[PDB]
Amino acid sequence: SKGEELFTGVVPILVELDGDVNGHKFSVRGEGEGDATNGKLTLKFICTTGKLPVPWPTLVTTLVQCFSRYPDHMKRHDFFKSAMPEGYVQERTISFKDDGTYKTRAEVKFEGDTLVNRIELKGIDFKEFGNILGHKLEYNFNSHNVYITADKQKNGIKANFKIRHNVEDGSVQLADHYQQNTPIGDGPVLLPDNHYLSTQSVLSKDPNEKRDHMVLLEFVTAAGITH
Numbered sequence: 602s603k604g605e606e607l608f609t610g611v612v613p614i615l616v617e618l619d620g621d622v623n624g625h626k627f628s629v630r631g632e633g634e635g636d637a638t639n640g641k642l643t644l645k646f647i648c649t650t651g652k653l654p655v656p657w658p659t660l661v662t663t664l665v666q667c668f669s670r671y672p673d674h675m676k677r678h679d680f681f682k683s684a685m686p687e688g689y690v691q692e693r694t695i696s697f698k699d700d701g702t703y704k705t706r707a708e709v710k711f712e713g714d715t716l717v718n719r720i721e722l723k724g725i726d727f728k729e730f731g732n733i734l735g736h737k738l739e740y741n742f743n744s745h746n747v748y749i750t751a752d753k754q755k756n757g758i759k760a761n762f763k764i765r766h767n768v769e770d771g772s773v774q775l776a777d778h779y780q781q782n783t784p785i786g787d788g789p790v791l792l793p794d795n796h797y798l799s800t801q802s803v804l805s806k807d808p809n810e811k812r813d814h815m816v817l818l819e820f821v822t823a824a825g826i827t828h
């Protein structure tokens with residue numbers, strides 16, 4: 602297909618986020634590459650405004666599902682690649698249980714040969730001494746299933762899923778994700794049957810990096826439709 606042909610090789614990635622959480626203004630820039638054939642991406646993110654005012658794990662889902670490995674028998678259900686190169690808008694509400702809410706708006710699209718994710722994030726009602734603004738979250742990220750359903754009215758998809766962040770006192774911080782994706786092109790796009798993405802992530806640090814940063818390794822495969 603047109604869209605899927607853009608992802609047969611290794612694709613450079615750029616991520617830019619401007620965020621405002623309880624009045625904290627911050628920016629993040631990420632760079633790396635994605636290999637959708639193997640469902641794998643490698644990225645390094647840097648807070649370009651100084652210290653990140655929220656924990657890095659809380660931004661992982663906001664910081665390119667077009668790099669998911671869709672098995673051959675499922676390629677008919679890969680909305681994300683089918684919207685390319687024109688791209689799609691990805692919007693989310695992320696409700697941290699007993700805490701504040703992120704609202705995000707992003708565009709994911711090709712800018713030349715680079716796949717770019719540009720994000721605006723607004724967070725309100727966060728607890729200044731809670732798990733997020735208090736930086737009480739472990740520096741890791743557990744495996745999740747993202748459940749995707751078509752949204753024929755918007756010619757796009759919706760997704761719902763619950764992220765679980767390990768709190769350093771042993772408890773767990775829930776973050777309910779509500780997600781809507783709309784194509785930017787006028788071209789036709791694949792609308793999928795119900796299915797899910799299975800995601801696994803590894804967070805690390807670059808020892809020679811003095812800025813506040815996150816190295817991210819991610820592995821995503823699609824599933825939920827019988828061969």
Ligand code: NA
Nearest residue numbers: 686711712713
């Ligand atoms: Na372009």
